[PDB]
Amino acid sequence: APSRNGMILKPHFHKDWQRRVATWFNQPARKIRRRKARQARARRIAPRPAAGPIRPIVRCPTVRYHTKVRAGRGFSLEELRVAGIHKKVARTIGISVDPRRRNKSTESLQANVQRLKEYRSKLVLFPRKPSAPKKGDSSAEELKLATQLTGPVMPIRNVFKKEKARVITEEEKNFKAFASLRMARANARLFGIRAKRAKEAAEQDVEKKK
């Protein structure tokens, strides 16, 4: 029995919902439990980065978000083999790898290779046995100046290149942008049937000549 005026609406309470209800009174209990587990892990991996391994520059998919840059799953192994880091040694020294990611581009691959080299310049690899150092190893006086960094290792900024204020050329002020958009729409929409009618006109001209 609806009254005078208002939304007619569909509450999804026709099922037995009181039996299946999630009360969140352990919300601060979990917000204490997670940070206790996180402090324990950050003490357990004692000089290592507290956030974990390093994760690559990625673009988002799906037109709404492709302007932005995220942290990805892991460094692609094409991006590793041209950085000089072996696919098994990367995960040991702290480089996340996933083999599933392709590399469609070249700019992203060069950015991730530069990121791996800039990381490899910054890690302080301790000796696997503390008394005798080896060749793939850092110096003794750098070992005292190591500490855990907090937050993600080399945090991903979304930086924008600012253009300076140009002077408008006469060539740019004749660019009819709306009509160019609309002409591109119509050409992309009609491109197949243009070619089909060109095809049938070609064989009908063959019919008229032969």
Partner: protein
């Protein structure tokens, strides 16, 4: 039931308004004695003590 709406969330800006009003009223002598603190021998009631 347990899922009574126990909690209330307040906007951050008026949470800040409230403590600014509390601090600013803790500097007036009439608004402290009317709260009840027997204060009449205090040197000055916006009362700052040595950092030691």
């Amino acid at each position: 039931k347990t899922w009574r709406r126990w909690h209330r969330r307040v906007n951050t800006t008026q949470k800040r308004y409230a403590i600014c009003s509390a601090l600013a009223a803790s500097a007036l002598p009439a608004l402290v004695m009317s709260k009840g603190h027997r204060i009449e021998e205090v040197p000055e009631l916006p009362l700052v003590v040595e950092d030691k």
